[PDB]
Amino acid sequence: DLGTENLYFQSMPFEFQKMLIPEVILIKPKVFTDDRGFFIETFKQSDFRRHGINGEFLQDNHSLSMKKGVLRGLHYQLDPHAQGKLVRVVLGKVFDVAVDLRRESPTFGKWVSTELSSTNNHMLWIPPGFAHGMLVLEENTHLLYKCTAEYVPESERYIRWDDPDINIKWPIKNNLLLSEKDAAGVFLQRAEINAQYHG
Amino acid sequence: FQSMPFEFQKMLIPEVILIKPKVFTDDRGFFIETFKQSDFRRHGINGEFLQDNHSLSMKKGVLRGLHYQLDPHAQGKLVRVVLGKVFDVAVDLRRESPTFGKWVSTELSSTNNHMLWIPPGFAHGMLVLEENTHLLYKCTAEYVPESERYIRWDDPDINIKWPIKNNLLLSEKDAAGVFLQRAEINAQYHG
Ligand SMILES: O[C@@H]1[C@@H](O)[C@@H](O)OC[C@H]1O
Ligand SMILES: O[C@@H]1[C@@H](O)[C@@H](O)OC[C@H]1O
Ligand SMILES: O[C@@H]1[C@@H](O)[C@H](O)OC[C@H]1O
Ligand SMILES: O[C@@H]1[C@@H](O)[C@H](O)OC[C@H]1O
Ligand code: NA
Ligand code: NA
Ligand code: NA
Ligand code: NA
Ligand code: NA
Ligand code: NA
């Protein structure tokens, strides 16, 4: 096999890029274009585990946001129910944010962001101990999540999207559409957090 | 209105399962829990889903299939349509099965949000009924290209009644699938 001699080069199906908080990973899957559309391998356990994305994905969720300006977050589940999340957008576009909420983390309360869209087909890995938020930038946006842990309603916590300590620079700040739970999120200084940093 | 979080319905080939998730709608849009390992395993959907794929069929009348992977690489598949609509087919290709060569179908759409479980030992085929149809697959084995096999969509022993209404669009691989009587199949029935 010519590949085994390194004389024939075949691309792996993903590019993994560590973000400035390096446990957060941007994944760029290959779009295979054919005469009737495209095919994307969006997840392969062997490749993902080789890049430190560990755990079993026990739950998948699908949200549709009809209007630009929908904002969902900041969301996390208390230990022992913390969800690692693989986030992607099958239609539309979001500004996606990951916030480090691991006690004793040198990047506690820090965040990174990226645009996930149906145009780029990018995916974000948000490890356990992080909160997720998203702002919808296009109508009819469909977000898909793979989660490590199953949903546990009593473990769910909410931090205010515009918390002034986290100070996320959201590209839109007026006429946002928030759920009642999200409108009522707590400020970081009063948030209940039990996730611990482990190096 | 659905009261329960998933409804699991066995097909006339009872290993094939139609799943109907509950859609939670509010003024922002909707939320669906499309998979939960705990619930799925309680209804006989076993295995680890090691590979996910997303296929967009821009053109109505795309027909893909009939596809399966030889043991030990058989992929069980959960199939759903996130946008658009397909006629989805599962064919039992387990040697010694009482339903060997038989098929069941369902219409999967972004309107019904239904999902089909196609267990290992079965071939999958689909016919795209709407433009810009997005299919999502969860597979129980990672893809092994050399294990992939192809049976003619129009095999006369299987005799799928495809609801063809448009010019049919077949790949060269699919146009070149073999007839069932000549196909290489190693899956074995155990049920
Ligand atoms: O590091 C800071 C943290 O201590 C907290 O205040 O959240 C904001 C972060 O910038
Ligand atoms: O029972 C039939 C079987 O014998 C085989 O030929 O495939 C088609 C089935 O309908
Ligand atoms: O669009 C894809 C791109 O994001 C990746 O970087 O290279 C493969 C392409 O198909
Ligand atoms: O057609 C192939 C399908 O059968 C398999 O499950 O995933 C890869 C595709 O190329
Ligand atoms: Na897990
Ligand atoms: Na896309
Ligand atoms: Na999903
Ligand atoms: Na099963
Ligand atoms: Na296959
Ligand atoms: Na999926």
Residue numbers in the entry:
A (entry chain AAA): -10 to 188
B (entry chain BBB): -2 to 188
Study text:
Streptose forms the central moiety of the antibiotic streptomycin, while DHHS is found in the O-antigen of the zoonotic pathogen C. burnetii. Genome sequencing of S. griseus and C. burnetii has identified StrM and CBU1838 proteins as RmlC orthologs in these respective species. The evidence presented in this and previous studies strongly suggests that both CBU1838 and StrM act as TDP-4-keto-(6-deoxy)-glucose 3’’, 5’’ double epimerases. RmlC uses a histidine base to deprotonate the substrate and a tyrosine acid to reprotonate from the opposite side of the sugar.
We determined the structures of StrM and CBU1838 by X-ray crystallography, in the presence and absence of TDP. Both proteins show an overall dimeric architecture consistent with previously solved members of this family. A phylogenetic tree suggests that CBU1838 groups with other 3’’,5’’ epimerases, while StrM is closer in sequence to the single site epimerases. CBU1838 shows 27 to 53% identity with characterized RmlC orthologs. As C. burnetii does not produce rhamnose, it is unlikely that it would be required for rhamnose biosynthesis. This leaves DHHS biosynthesis as the only reasonable function of CBU1838. CBU1838 showed a lower kcat and a clearly higher KM. This is consistent with its expected 6’’-hydroxy substrate. CBU1838 contains a methionine residue (M123) in place of a phenylalanine conserved among other RmlC orthologs, which would provide space for the hydroxyl.
